[PDB]
Design a binder for these strands. Structure first.
Length: 468
RNA sequence: GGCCCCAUCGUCUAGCGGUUAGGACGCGGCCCUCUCAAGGCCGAAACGGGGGUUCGAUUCCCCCUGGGGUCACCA
């Protein structure tokens, strides 16, 4: 059938580049009613970040991607932690050895540095060791690596399903170490082993590993077994067209989540990174994507991640895709975080309704509608100026408000319009100073809803302090 | 630098031999209007250059240019 995967490396914060690839493997897989696996690349006992695996998988769920097999979501094909299958790589490496496709090397790291120094990179000198000698030194527990024995005089054909066939000159292909000294393998060794053993048919990965593919087709050759299809996604870039960097832009998914970004939005944004809907529609769901997916719709340029457009998307989602109920729910965590609290669900909802078009990130909500949840809100100069400037006619109005029985957006609007009229003045002239008295902002939703929402007592009392 | 991939508005992009080169973010303008938004309408904004090829190339080939990626046992 069709089997795609993601081999994430638990060596840092959950990367957005990881989501990018994941999103496309999930799509292709689902699009073909095939399987999609998660394989953890944890065979670097040096750059391993403990607690980094959980985060990656949680991050993947957060965006809405479900995988058919993986570390938590078990499966039929062996452990999904590259670390739990070291013995495998072991045997397969030995396999190539006692097969003429690999050889043991013993050069210490420094000698290699020297080898690389005096001459490009390693020169496969270890290829000159008699198998028995190498075998012996190995038996005597002498430290060494197991490098791929590339047929030096030759050429290797690679085929990107998106770019076509890219013939290579073995001269360009090194005898890459497969099994490291510590007995641990390299992406090269474990990817082909696990990809095949797990039955992956389509390898969708970052363009980053394009050039490394000829090593893989070679390995698939040595083991004597069918190569999968290869698709290389273009690398996401920093504003400076360079592949996304942690210090040139936010690459941590935990940051996006923290900054009040909707997973659905980020995911939808991610889709636009290469793929595009026939009808040019920019907003759609995960399923519509897995459904409209076609490699003939994938662009190959390097896309620059635009936080601006992302923000725009998050706002759009908040105001058109999610329901009021949905927003009011997601907004709470940010409320609690900002120290604010809401009186009731009803209150919160209406508060969220009036703000819906005024924030593009959940974080932005408790920020701009703070006065809606606490007495401890700031007062802008412009606001103070507008308040002081209108305090008089405000006093000339307070009694009317301390009187008005029908505390309704409709009613309140009538009184105020009447007021401004009877005072030979333009609405805004009464509305703004009041707005500033109530919110201390001058940048606020409608006056009548603000007036109303708070409630007669609540509203007047506050406006009283302002006039105080 | 060698090898390799890529190349339409500032950004994400549609295009498939013949278009007024479309859309979206961002930008500007007007409408709307109690403020700010949101929303609607309008506008500015692109095919890197040179040869081909073809009647016709943004569209196909090649070269240049430009951009990017990659050249590591982190034991």
């Amino acid at each position: 059938m069709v089997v795609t995967r993601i081999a994430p490396s638990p060596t840092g914060d959950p990367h957005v580049g990881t989501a990018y690839i994941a999103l496309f493997n999930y799509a292709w897989a689902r699009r073909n009613g095939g399987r999609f696996i998660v394989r953890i690349e944890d065979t670097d006992r040096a750059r391993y970040v403990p607690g980094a695996e959980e985060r990656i998988l949680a991050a993947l769920k957060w965006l809405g991607l479900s995988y058919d097999e993986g570390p938590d979501v078990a499966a039929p094909t062996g452990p999904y932690r590259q670390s739990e299958r070291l013995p495998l790589y072991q045997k397969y490496a030995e396999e190539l050895l006692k097969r003429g496709w690999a050889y043991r090397a013993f050069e210490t790291p420094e000698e290699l540095e020297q080898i690389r120094k005096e001459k490009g990179g390693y020169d496969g000198r270890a290829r000159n060791i008699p198998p028995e000698e190498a075998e012996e030194r190995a038996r005597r527990g002498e430290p060494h690596v197991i490098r791929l024995k590339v047929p030096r005089p030759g050429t290797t054909e690679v085929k990107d399903e998106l770019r076509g066939v890219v013939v290579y000159d073995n001269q360009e292909i090194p005898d890459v170490v497969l099994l490291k000294s510590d007995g641990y393998p390299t992406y090269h060794l474990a990817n082909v082993v696990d990809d095949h053993l797990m039955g992956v048919t389509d390898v969708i990965r970052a363009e980053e590993w394009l050039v490394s593919t000829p090593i893989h087709v070679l390995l698939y050759r040595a083991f004597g077994w069918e190569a999968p299809r290869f698709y290389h996604m273009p690398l996401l870039r920093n504003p400076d067209k360079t592949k996304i960097s942690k210090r040139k832009s936010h690459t941590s998914l935990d940051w996006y989540k923290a900054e009040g970004f909707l997973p659905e939005a980020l995911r939808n944004y991610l889709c636009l990174m290469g793929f595009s809907m026939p009808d040019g529609r920019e907003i759609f769901t995960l399923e519509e994507f897995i459904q409209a997916f076609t490699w003939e719709r994938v662009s190959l340029g390097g896309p620059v991640f635009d936080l601006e457009k992302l923000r725009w998307m998050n706002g759009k989602y908040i105001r058109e895709v999610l329901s009021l109920e949905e927003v009011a729910e997601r907004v709470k965590p940010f409320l609690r975080e900002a120290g604010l609290s809401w009186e009731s669900e009803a209150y919160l909802r209406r508060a969220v309704e009036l703000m819906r078009p005024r924030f593009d990130t959940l974080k932005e909500f408790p920020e701009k509608a703070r006065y809606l949840f606490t007495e401890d809100y700031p007062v802008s100069e412009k606001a103070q100026r507008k308040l002081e400037e209108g305090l008089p006619l405000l006093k000339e109005l307070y009694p009317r408000l301390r009187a008005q029985e029908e505390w309704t957006e409709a009613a309140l609007e009538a009184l105020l319009r009447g007021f401004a009229a009877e005072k030979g003045v333009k609405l805004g002239q009464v509305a703004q100073p009041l707005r500033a008295a109530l919110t201390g902002s001058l940048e606020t939703p409608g006056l009548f809803e603000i007036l109303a929402l708070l409630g007669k007592e609540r509203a007047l009392r506050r406006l009283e302090r302002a006039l105080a």
